Amino acid sequence: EVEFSHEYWMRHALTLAKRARDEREVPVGAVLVLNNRVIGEGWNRAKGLHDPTAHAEIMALRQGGLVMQNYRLIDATLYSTFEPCVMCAGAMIHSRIGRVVFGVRNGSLMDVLHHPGMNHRVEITEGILADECAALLCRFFRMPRRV
Amino acid sequence: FSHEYWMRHALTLAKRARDEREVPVGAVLVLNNRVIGEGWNRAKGLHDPTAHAEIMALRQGGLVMQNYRLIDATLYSTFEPCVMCAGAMIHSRIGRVVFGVRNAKTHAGSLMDVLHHPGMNHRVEITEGILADECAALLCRFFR
Ligand SMILES: [Zn+2]
Ligand SMILES: [Zn+2]
């Protein structure tokens, strides 16, 4: 019936990214959307959980699998405040999601577009709320806005 | 405590995945000749697209060591790790991945392009071919 904008979901991901920031983790937030509903939320928790896979995007994808009772999450859209790493990019491929939408650019997702392990095609949208996403990462890494 | 010794344990784990009707891949994470992580493929039955054998072993390893970084560990996998699991090995900063048989479909190499990329912070060493035929026999029996 209705669809929220990209910016609406990115703003929720930005809220989640601050949860990681407050816990002294790389401040990335992610939200997985199917039929205009949240089926997954994530923020970075690798350090506190002792889990090298606990990135924001992975946590949202795992929550989606639990919501759908299906390791395949067809036609879902994953929002991430930061360009996903190679581990998370492969997880989306195996998840068979429809679209990834990320804020600021960064291995990373762009480096692995035509990698031989890409049986499925995921659509890419970038730049949504780029300024807000970059502000979190620059404040966490003490870098200028140029980076 | 040879490569073949650890691969044989991963082969035992790969049959657990077979018994669960999953793509039969097993993995064992070894640090200083001790097992710190064991995993087998469970992605379909667990509704988790990340629940591959290699990730399951690394996740248990992170909790056994109380550290998401698993320095100097060696990960044994009966099957060539996918891109997702290769990315997990990089972030875990393990020393070496040892796998049996390659993926005939997705391989160009593909794992080297991701694990041993020269412009990367960490390089994971690759050893392949350990009990490859035994690893392949499990996967072929599962496919048709
Ligand atoms: Zn990631
Ligand atoms: Zn994998």
Residue numbers in the entry:
A (entry chain B): 3 to 108, 115 to 155
B (entry chain A): 6 to 113, 115 to 150
Q: What do the authors say?
A:
To confer the favorable attributes of ABEs upon a CBE, we envisioned transforming TadA into an enzyme capable of robust cytidine deamination and subsequently generated an improved class of CBEs that uses TadA instead of a naturally occurring cytidine deaminase. Here we describe the development of two families of base editors, CABE-Ts and CBE-Ts, which use variants of TadA to catalyze the deamination of cytosines with either retention (CABE-Ts) or loss (CBE-Ts) of adenine deamination. To illuminate how amino acid substitutions identified from directed evolution affect TADAC’s substrate tolerance, we determined crystal structures of TadA*8.20 from ABE8.20-m13, the template used to evolve CABE-T1, and TADAC-1 variants from CABE-T1 reported here. Through X-ray crystallography, we show how the accumulation of substitutions impacts the shape of the active site cavity and may contribute to the accommodation of cytosine as substrate and the subsequent shift in specificity toward C-to-U deamination.
Notably, the crystal structure of TADAC-1.14 containing four substitutions (S2H, I49K, Y76I and G112H) reveals a structural difference in the loop between strands β4 and β5 (R107 to V130) on the right side of the active site cavity. This loop contains a G112H substitution that dramatically alters its flexibility and conformation relative to TadA*8.20 by introducing a bulky positively charged residue. Indeed, a comparison with the structure of TadA*8.20 bound to ssDNA substrate shows that TADAC-1.14 may engage ssDNA differently than TadA variants with strict adenine specificity. We hypothesize that residue K49 within TADAC-1.14 may contribute to the stabilization of protein–DNA interactions required for binding cytosine-containing ssDNA substrates due to its repositioning near nucleobase dC(10) (~4.5 Å).
